[PDB]
């Protein structure tokens, strides 16, 4: 059981990015959630249940779809979104939960 993410993306300041996530087994329930971690800080929950927003999080952030295959698209990009982004899924009776490698987001001038 493993998950994978993209590598080192860069993107422009009204810009849009899509971060792709794969899992080798299909998740249990719809248990896939998203986090951002800024350096020197603990993780912050963004999306849970594949597509539901967490508390205080804007609707620039959207998550999709089901599997196996998931995507997180951030639109209307701002500077404070440069961070690392993580994927995290639930399964079934040992190896219950798993994290991916993490995709760092470099925000760039337009």
């Amino acid at each position: 059981l493993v998950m994978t993410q993209t590598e080192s993306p860069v993107s422009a300041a009204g810009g849009t990015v899509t971060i792709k996530c794969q899992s080798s087994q299909s998740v249990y329930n719809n248990r896939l959630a998203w986090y951002q971690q800024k350096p020197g800080q603990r993780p912050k929950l963004l999306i849970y249940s594949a597509s539901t927003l967490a508390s205080g999080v804007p609707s620039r952030f959207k998550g999709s779809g089901s599997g196996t295959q998931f995507t997180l698209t951030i639109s209307d990009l701002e500077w404070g979104d440069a961070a690392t982004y993580y994927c995290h899924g639930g399964y079934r009776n040992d190896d219950r939960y798993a994290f991916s490698g993490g995709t760092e987001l470099e925000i760039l001038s337009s």
Partner: nanobody, 118 residues
Framework: SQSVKESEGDLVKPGASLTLTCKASGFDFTWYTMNWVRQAPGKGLEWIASIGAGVYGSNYYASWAKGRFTISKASSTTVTLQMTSLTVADTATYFC???????????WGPGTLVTVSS
């Protein structure tokens, strides 16, 4: 509003044992599953172990962690991670995180540093 705080991180020699402790504020583990997640320097988040809601909550482990780690609910407000046979690769910031809703780690501690070295 609600929070958890890890404790008891240390510098320690290879082959030694160590116990971490996470203490809740403003809530109970009666309704939530609690997790230990670590972060080695230069590397991503890694799930270690979970323990289920309530007194008779069930435990799960990552494959790699089964022999040398043990997760425990000391009480309704305190979690425990027993780390037995440490190696240098076990050097990391260790996190306590609450499964608030259907897999979303709603809340995190700051973390404690465990360093394994000569």
């Amino acid at each position: 509003s609600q929070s958890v705080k890890e404790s008891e991180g240390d510098l320690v020699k290879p082959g030694a044992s160590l116990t971490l402790t996470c203490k809740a504020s403003g809530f109970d583990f009666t309704w939530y599953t609690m997790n230990w997640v670590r972060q080695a320097p230069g590397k991503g988040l890694e799930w270690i172990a979970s323990i289920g809601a309530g007194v008779y909550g069930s435990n799960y482990y990552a494959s790699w962690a089964k022999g040398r780690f043990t997760i425990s609910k000391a009480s309704s407000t305190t979690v425990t991670l027993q780390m037995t046979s440490l190696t240098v690769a076990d050097t990391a910031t260790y996190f306590c995180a609450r499964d608030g809703i259907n897999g979303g780690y709603d809340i995190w501690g700051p973390g404690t540093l465990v360093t394994v070295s000569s």
